[PDB]
Design a protein around this nucleic acid. Structure first.
Ligand SMILES: [Mg+2]
Ligand SMILES: [Mg+2]
Ligand SMILES: [Mg+2]
Ligand SMILES: [Mg+2]
Ligand SMILES: [Mg+2]
Ligand SMILES: [Mg+2]
Ligand SMILES: [Mg+2]
Ligand SMILES: [Mg+2]
Ligand SMILES: [Mg+2]
Ligand SMILES: [Mg+2]
Ligand SMILES: [Mg+2]
Ligand SMILES: [Mg+2]
Ligand SMILES: [Zn+2]
Ligand SMILES: [Zn+2]
Lengths: 94, 238, 51, 82, 100, 56
RNA sequence: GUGAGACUCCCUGCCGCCGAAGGGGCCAGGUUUCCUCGGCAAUGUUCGUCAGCCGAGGGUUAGUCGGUCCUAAGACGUACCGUAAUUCGAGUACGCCGAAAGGGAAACAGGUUAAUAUUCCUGUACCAUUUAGCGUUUAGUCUGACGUCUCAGGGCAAGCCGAGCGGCGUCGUCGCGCCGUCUAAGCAGCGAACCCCGUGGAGAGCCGUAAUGGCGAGAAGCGGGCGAAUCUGUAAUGGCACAAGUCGGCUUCACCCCGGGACCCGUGAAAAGGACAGCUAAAUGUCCGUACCGAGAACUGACACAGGUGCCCCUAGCUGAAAAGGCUAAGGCGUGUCGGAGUAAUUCAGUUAAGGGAAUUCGGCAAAUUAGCUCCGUAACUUCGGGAUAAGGAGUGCCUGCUGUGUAGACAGCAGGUCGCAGUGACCAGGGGGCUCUAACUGUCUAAUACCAACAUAGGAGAUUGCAAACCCGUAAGGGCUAG
RNA sequence: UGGAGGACCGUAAACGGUAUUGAUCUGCAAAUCAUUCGUGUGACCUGCGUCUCGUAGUGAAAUGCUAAUCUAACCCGGCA
């Protein structure tokens, strides 16, 4: 499907561009964060996966055109999720 | 006179320690509103601010003047903001902290009324309203302390955007170098024990050791408060 | 090429005109008592500070 | 103040006189309008244009182009350049 | 003015003719890495453009419907044919053209 | 380069222009003051008592 | 030849040097060194009739080339305030300056001089401000106006090939080799991609790209609109031995236009100006620079200095991956300013050496070995990325005839013959392996005796401070960090 | 297919300065030359402009650099 994931070429992932440098821990952290960033995120108006990162904390929908501010590396954060959940439950209880 | 230290050089304000002000987009402050007024406005664009490494919003108000604003998370181009006393509680509006319910998150809080906002401004931080007495309200600051603010203070509801900025390690001197070009900080910094006895209280010797205790009292004169300034404790937790 | 204003060129013209051999009739009249002046130079030596 | 001092009579200036032109030494603190008006009043010939130069001796040369043909010849005749 | 003496080019001209025929180019004359003599991206570009133009003209004249056209387009994108004759061989073997 | 003749080839700029008030080549082009007569700094002319021995 | 006087000054022929710099264009800097005539006491590492030297005279022409105009970092002035006081001091208000490599209204070809030329002359143009006549805003937007890397498409200067025509060379034999076969702005016409609009009705899927991709929130297809470089005609009569002056083709960077993608805890200037309402006519377009060098002789280092500033920007044919190294054009030179003679030791830098092969020395210091490209093959260890060009083997020239990919330029492969001691035949071009100590790595450092294990670094931890804060500068007025 | 990286090789482009403990050592030079070397898409090299200075400045820190001068510059005065 993607590039050759041979018997070896499978652990580094996107951190394979650093070669033999910076140690195992940092490379693993950067790699995992990169697979989270490259994910197919979902829109809020469209409800179609079209969201990609334009800048530091700026996101946009390719089809929908919608622009919004979010996380630096991921569109939606857990704390914002909790705020939405709590405020929406309070509103809906009224 | 053994040479002055880096802190005193920053005090003088030489060009090496001055912020490159012309790079920054604009100052962030709350809209100025007279007594018993409520102005609205809808976002026109979302923009990057080089002075904080976080997004900011451009909003055009009904009078005509547009202002950059500290962008809370979720702000999108098109939504209208209703800053004023009569605003409802929603993510984005600016309302007094006296009539904010307990448990709600806020940010860009002011010290005294009509300051524009001074607390809770870096990426992904937020504060909480705890209690509402008649004369004050206690909010838990992101540091972890309780602060007693005036009920007639303004603060945008939500949390500051850009959350998670420090989950990505530098892993190079080059990337951190590039960040420091748009700040007043100096990069890189020499360590005190590697200097000469003219330059620092810790310098000198045939081997690199502090020589004297690193904890310094709070009453030490300028040019000597180097190290652990008036520490209450030291070491990790055993 | 050292783009000059009017005054710089004016001073350069004067310093040029000062490089002159003393007139022969002056040497004849003063009976070989004046044979030089302190304004003589050469272009590839000490730079003039006219500008 | 007077802006024309005297005609300039080197070999190059002589050849300009063939196609109806002169070459004066003018006062170094003067512009083209003043030169135009002075020459026009002094000889009554309607000047066409004027080109100016600053020389390394200090003085300032000006080349006048006249409209009426054969004018420069008779100006140089009366002035005594001939 | 004495005439300018140029640099003659007859010898190189004859050598170029011989090389254009396919000689004087052995292993003992290569001195630059493969890729410096033929970049790989250009090879891919010419190959894929030829394959796509051939498939498009087969669709245009009418001897290839939509379904097999789509399959062959993505297959050539995937790299299963190395030349136009190779593609023609597979088309004339697996019968996917509507020649009659 | 070296501190001697090798770094004296870059000696093509100028730091002092010519002063209008005194005619001396002492006008600092950065601070805009004459270092000999004080032109630009003040309307008076620069004189100090340490420019001569104590006259006794 | 000149001259009293010729290794050294001039002309012709031969023989040479640089030829991606020693050539061409020009900043800063220089300041008359520029051209002609007349000289040789001194200057020139020798001589000199020569000269960047000495004396006399001469030479720089602008509405279109620059400055001038706008603003960036940041200065300066007046006021307010402080200071015993100022010519001293931070901030605030109002001004004003700051780029000959940022923004920017407008001109090209040929001729002419001893030395100036988009400036003078011939021809053909263009742009502003004012005055007069004839009309009118949309006045709020667009442009000026923007990073690093990577790629497609189009165009073109240079380059190359074939045919005809005109010259020059060679000519022991042959019939080849070289040069030329030209043409500006301006004006008129056309328009590739992107984008916009009207139809269209596509899914158990179709349409595309070098690649990423697009689609009922409307694909494919079919129409229309806005819209580039460049190209076609004229300008076309100027220059050419008024000698020819006609045509085709290939390629095209390092230059111009247009579009896509990726990256950022980096987000990659501002203002004047211009566009949207102008058309016709006459008049006006002031000021400053303009010579020459721009460097192994015109700058700077006391010098006609092997350094530095400037390698700052440009450069033809063959070999070759190549702007490397080698050999030649155009251009510049025989001035990196002492000659003759040929015979010792010694000395600076090179070529070769029987047999042995580190036995030399503190120490393989120094020198030698290997070296391009294609194919096969590749270990311990490992942070799984590497190690790795590991190690270790084989092939390579020339001639004859071909095959495959591709629109082409070109690239790849084969069969037979054949020469030499040797086929990357010169130039160019790694010696390799093993065991330890030490610093993680890329980076920095005693300019002129120390390039290291020292400094820095990402990572780890601790401390102060809720902003009228912590830390710091000032005598004060006030400030840095902080558009935080 | 694609084209990332304080990746690799490498120019006498540019920047640096290991070894010869070579040449020179009243030198071409008050720090240069020849061969051999290190980086060469970045924490890169660089033109012009502008700012920071003497008990002060700047310094990836050697007491380095601040006009051939630096464990406190230079000019004049105290000073004969
Ligand atoms: Mg001390
Ligand atoms: Mg020094
Ligand atoms: Mg006295
Ligand atoms: Mg040569
Ligand atoms: Mg002599
Ligand atoms: Mg002029
Ligand atoms: Mg100005
Ligand atoms: Mg000799
Ligand atoms: Mg190290
Ligand atoms: Mg250390
Ligand atoms: Mg390298
Ligand atoms: Mg003294
Ligand atoms: Zn959407
Ligand atoms: Zn003065």
């Amino acid at each position: 499907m993607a590039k050759k994931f041979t018997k070896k070429g499978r652990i580094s992932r996107s951190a394979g561009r650093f070669g033999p440098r910076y140690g195992r821990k940092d490379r693993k952290l950067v790699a995992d964060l990169e697979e989270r960033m490259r994910a197919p995120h979902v829109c809020t108006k469209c409800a179609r996966p079209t969201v990609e990162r334009i800048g530091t904390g700026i996101w946009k929908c390719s089809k929908c055109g919608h622009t919004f501010a979010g996380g630096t590396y991921i569109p939606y954060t857990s704390v914002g999720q909790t705020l939405l959940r709590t405020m929406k439950n309070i509103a809906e209880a009224k | 006179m053994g040479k002055r230290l880096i802190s005193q050089n920053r005090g003088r304000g030489t060009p090496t320690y001055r912020a490159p002000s012309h790079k920054y987009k604009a100052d962030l402050r709350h809209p100025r509103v007279d007594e018993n007024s409520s102005l609205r406005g809808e976002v026109v664009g979302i923009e990057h601010d080089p002075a904080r490494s976080a997004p900011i919003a451009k909003v055009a108000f009904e009078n005509g003047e547009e202002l950059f604003l500290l962008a809370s998370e979720g702000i999108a181009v098109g939504n209208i903001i209703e800053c004023g006393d009569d605003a409802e509680v929603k993510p984005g509006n600016i309302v007094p902290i006296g009539n904010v319910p307990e448990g709600f998150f806020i940010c860009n809080v002011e010290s005294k009324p009509n300051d524009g906002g001074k607390f809770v401004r870096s990426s992904g931080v937020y504060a909480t309203v705890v209690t509402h007495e008649a004369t004050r309200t206690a909010v838990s600051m992101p540091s972890g302390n309780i602060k007693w603010l005036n009920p007639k203070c303004r603060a945008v509801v939500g949390i500051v955007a850009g959350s998670g900025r420090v989950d990505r390690p530098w892993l190079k001197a080059g990337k951190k170098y590039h960040k420091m070009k748009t700040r007043a900080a100096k990069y890189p910094r020499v360590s005190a024990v590697a200097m000469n006895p003219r330059d620092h209280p810790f310098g000198g010797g045939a081997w690199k050791h502090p020589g004297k205790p690193t904890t310094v009292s709070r009453n030490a004169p300028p040019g000597r408060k180097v190290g652990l300034i008036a520490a209450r404790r030291t070491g990790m937790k055993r | 090429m050292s783009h000059n204003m009017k005054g710089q060129k004016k001073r350069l013209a004067k310093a040029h005109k000062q490089n002159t051999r003393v007139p022969v009739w002056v040497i004849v009249k003063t009976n070989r008592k004046v044979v030089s002046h302190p304004r003589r130079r050469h272009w590839r030596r000490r730079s003039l500070d006219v500008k | 103040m007077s802006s024309i001092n005297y005609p300039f009579v080197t070999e190059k200036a002589m050849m300009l006189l063939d196609e109806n032109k002169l070459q004066f030494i003018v006062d170094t603190r003067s512009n083209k309008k003043q030169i135009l008006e002075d020459v026009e009043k002094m000889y009554g010939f309607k000047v066409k244009s004027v080109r100016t130069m600053t020389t390394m001796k200090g003085m300032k040369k000006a080349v006048l182009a006249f409209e009426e043909p054969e004018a420069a010849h008779e100006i140089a005749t009366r002035i005594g350049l001939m | 003015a004495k005439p300018v003496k140029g640099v003659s080019r007859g010898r190189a001209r004859a050598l170029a003719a011989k090389r254009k025929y396919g000689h004087c180019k052995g292993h003992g004359s290569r001195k630059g890495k493969k890729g410096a003599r033929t970049p790989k991206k250009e090879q891919w570009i010419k190959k894929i453009r030829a394959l796509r133009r051939r498939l498009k003209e087969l669709r245009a004249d009418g001897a290839l419907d939509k379904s097999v056209y789509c399959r062959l387009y993505r297959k050539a994108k995937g790299g299963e044919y190395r030349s136009v004759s190779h593609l023609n061989s597979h088309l004339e073997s697996e019968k996917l053209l509507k020649k009659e | 380069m070296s501190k001697g003749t090798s770094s004296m080839g870059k000696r093509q700029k100028r730091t002092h222009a010519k002063c209008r008030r005194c005619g001396s080549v002492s006008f600092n082009v950065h601070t805009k003051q004459c270092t000999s007569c004080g032109f630009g700094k003040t309307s008076r002319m620069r004189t100090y008592k340490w420019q001569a021995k104590c006259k006794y």
